[PDB]
Amino acid sequence: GSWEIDPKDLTFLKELGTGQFGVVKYGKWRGQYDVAIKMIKEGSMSEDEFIEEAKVMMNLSHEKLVQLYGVCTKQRPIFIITEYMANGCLLNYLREMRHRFQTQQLLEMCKDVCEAMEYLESKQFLHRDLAARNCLVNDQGVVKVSDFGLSRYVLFPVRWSPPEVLMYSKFSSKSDIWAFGVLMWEIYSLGKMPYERFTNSETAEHIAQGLRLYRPHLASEKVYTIMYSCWHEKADERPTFKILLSNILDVMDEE
Numbered sequence: 001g002s003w004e005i006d007p008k009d010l011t012f013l014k015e016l017g018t019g020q021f022g023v024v025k026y027g028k029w030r031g032q033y034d035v036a037i038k039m040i041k042e043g044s045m046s047e048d049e050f051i052e053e054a055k056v057m058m059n060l061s062h063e064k065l066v067q068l069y070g071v072c073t074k075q076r077p078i079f080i081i082t083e084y085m086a087n088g089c090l091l092n093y094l095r096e097m098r099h100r101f102q103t104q105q106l107l108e109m110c111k112d113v114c115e116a117m118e119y120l121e122s123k124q125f126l127h128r129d130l131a132a133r134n135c136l137v138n139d140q141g142v143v144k145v146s147d148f149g150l151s152r153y154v155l156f157p158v159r160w161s162p163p164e165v166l167m168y169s170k171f172s173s174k175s176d177i178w179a180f181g182v183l184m185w186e187i188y189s190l191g192k193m194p195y196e197r198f199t200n201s202e203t204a205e206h207i208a209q210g211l212r213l214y215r216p217h218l219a220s221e222k223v224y225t226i227m228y229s230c231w232h233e234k235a236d237e238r239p240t241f242k243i244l245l246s247n248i249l250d251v252m253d254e255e
């Protein structure tokens with residue numbers, strides 16, 4: 001099948017880390033092309049459901065999405081083969097103080113993610129776990145969005161969730177928007193934990209009381225207005241990703 005990679009075409013080279021489905025490794029496809037390979041631990045995934053959705057996810061092609069190249073399903077563990085991102089997770093990247101980021105670079109990261117998300121929104125596809133931990137950085141410093149949709153197959157992101165999610169499990173395009181605002185806060189805070197002094201339970205109470213994250217020192221007033229617009233209490237008063245991208249591009253021009 002066009003979604004199927006022969007595992008004999010893979011050369012495993014390095015271990016990258018361990019996520020919700022087990023170990024992820026760096027390797028080569030057909031001796032030449034860099035890939036990341038998720039080795040899906042038995043019992044961790046709703047595999048048949050994922051395999052059917054992987055057909056849809058293959059056709060999500062945008063330069064700012066970490067591409068799904070295919071799956072290896074004829075065996076267990078199954079494998080998910082994706083684009084390899086040389087500089088790893090955005091969260092860890094932001095926390096490395098040696099980068100000495102310019103705020104123009106931080107805004108560019110937000111724009112990268114916003115473009116990916118505008119594409120997903122145009123396909124009526126929710127990420128469902130948008131956060132710096134699910135963005136990666138390539139060898140050119142481009143940020144791409146990773147593992148969109150995959151939480152559906154896990155057999156909770158309190159700090160990235162709007163009130164209607166925490167109170168009613170009301171998931172929508174506007175809960176991705178809320179999460180994006182939090183991600184913008186992570187970026188401008190160089191990787192701090194949102195609501196860092198609170199537990200998840202205290203964060204949920206804070207959010208239900210109407211309180212919000214406040215301005216990271218590196219965010220201008222115009223950048224803070226953008227992330228804060230993602231956190232309106234009423235979901236329908238939150239922007240779309242098309243509007244956010246316009247907003248971010250405008251600020252990039254104004255500097």
Ligand SMILES: CC(C)OC1CN(C(=O)N[C@@H]2CCCCc3cc(-c4ccnc(Nc5cnn(C)c5)n4)ccc32)C1
Nearest residue numbers: 016017018019024036083084085086088129147150151
């Ligand atoms: C959304 C939730 C429900 O599920 C999802 C499945 N999931 C999950 O597997 N995460 C792990 C997190 C721990 C580390 C292992 C890793 C690696 C990569 C990956 C992909 C492409 N390139 C690179 N490159 C590169 C360079 N250095 N390092 C260190 C990495 N790395 C993606 C994800 C994950 C969360």
